[PDB]
Write a protein that binds this ligand. Structure first.
Ligand SMILES: O=S([O-])[O-]
Lengths: 223, 223
């Protein structure tokens, strides 16, 4: 069962072709990693696969259905319902508690606050933050902040989780903790597409796509 | 006096304030560094200051004149004629030789090819590439590729040069060489605004603006 498909993706910025024609497909349950050096365009690709930015050319299919870029508000809602994001930076709202930050995507779906908070507590508890539900971002360490972002990414049980160097700001201890969380999330059936410049992290995934100068130049499959 | 000034600059992306209100000034001839880590928003700020992206709120003044971000034509004219850019990646055109790569912005400005090549040859020679004018990017090392990018940045004798972690992809030897080039360029009278996360690089500049969570939180004056 294919969960995501990108066809002939190109991205041009100021006349420069960042992505030169990329096609790929992700199957349900796969943990994919995308690596590459400077100029690879790996993050630009991730933003397009995640429906954050529209490509210059090409199409994206989510669960077999072609994405409609005309209706941007509907696309934002589709993103919120089916996809989760974990960037290098936590992007937590400073005024909101850990729990309030996690329920944001749920409220966008029109979920009652009562039930949203119950699931939010569940998610935070599973990620080891059950005792810090009312803590605001300024009261959390880097590793805890990233875990709140992960809980938020899982808010609406996404079919796909996109991660852009999720452990970039973390020390070795939190890097292992976060990767283990991702492995557990994947074991739970959630597909993951993760960009990273760390081969050691890529080696823990099912498939690694290597990019160079806006093209996928190779792939290594580890079952 | 004032070569660049930004007032109340804010940048919002998908409802999140990447830049929460920034005001700063760069004196003519000054070499300023902006340092910050993840979440600082330093690169986003650089793109706005360099006219590559528009702010959500605020104004930018170049040479005392307010920039009109709604005028694409003027914006393109300003970037090409008054500014120079050096990113972590070289962004060279693979099909073009070093000299051809350097003269592109000159030809865009209407400069005669003969005169353009004369200046391009001068710039490349000054940057230690006088014997590699006909070499294409694939024939050059990463360090040499960046020097071509610096020559291109100086093509139209910009009054202000923007650099985003220009030595991030370079080893120690090349990083030192490139920084010496920037110091030499500033010694020539060209103003430079460089974003970096390296304290060592910032220490070589006249003044440093420290950023955190989309705000300028400190300033260090060394002269
Ligand atoms: O910017 S997205 O994660 O809502």
């Amino acid at each position: 069962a294919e969960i995501l498909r990108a066809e002939n993706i190109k991205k041009v910025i100021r006349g420069y072709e960042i992505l030169k024609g990329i096609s790929l497909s992700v199957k349900k349950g796969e943990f994919v990693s995308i690596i590459g050096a400077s100029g690879s365009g790996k993050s630009t690709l991730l933003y397009i696969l995640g429906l954050l930015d529209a490509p210059t050319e090409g199409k994206v299919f989510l669960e077999g259905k072609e994405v409609d870029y005309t209706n941007e508000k509907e696309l934002s809602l589709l993103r919120n319902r089916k996809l989760g994001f974990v960037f290098q930076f936590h992007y937590l709202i400073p005024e909101l508690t850990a729990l309030e930050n996690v329920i944001v995507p749920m409220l966008k779906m029109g979920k009652p606050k009562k039930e949203a908070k119950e699931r939010g507590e569940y998610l935070l508890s599973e990620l080891g933050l059950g005792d810090k539900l009312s803590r605001k971002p300024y009261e959390l360490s880097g590793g805890e902040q990233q875990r709140v972002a992960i809980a938020r990414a899982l808010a609406n049980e996404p079919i796909l989780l996109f991660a852009d160097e999720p452990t970039g700001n973390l020390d070795s201890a939190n890097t292992k903790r976060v990767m283990d969380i991702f492995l557990k999330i994947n074991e739970g059936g959630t597909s993951i597409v993760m960009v990273t410049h760390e081969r050691e992290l890529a080696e823990l995934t099912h498939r690694t796509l290597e990019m160079k100068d806006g093209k996928v130049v190779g792939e290594i499959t580890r079952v």
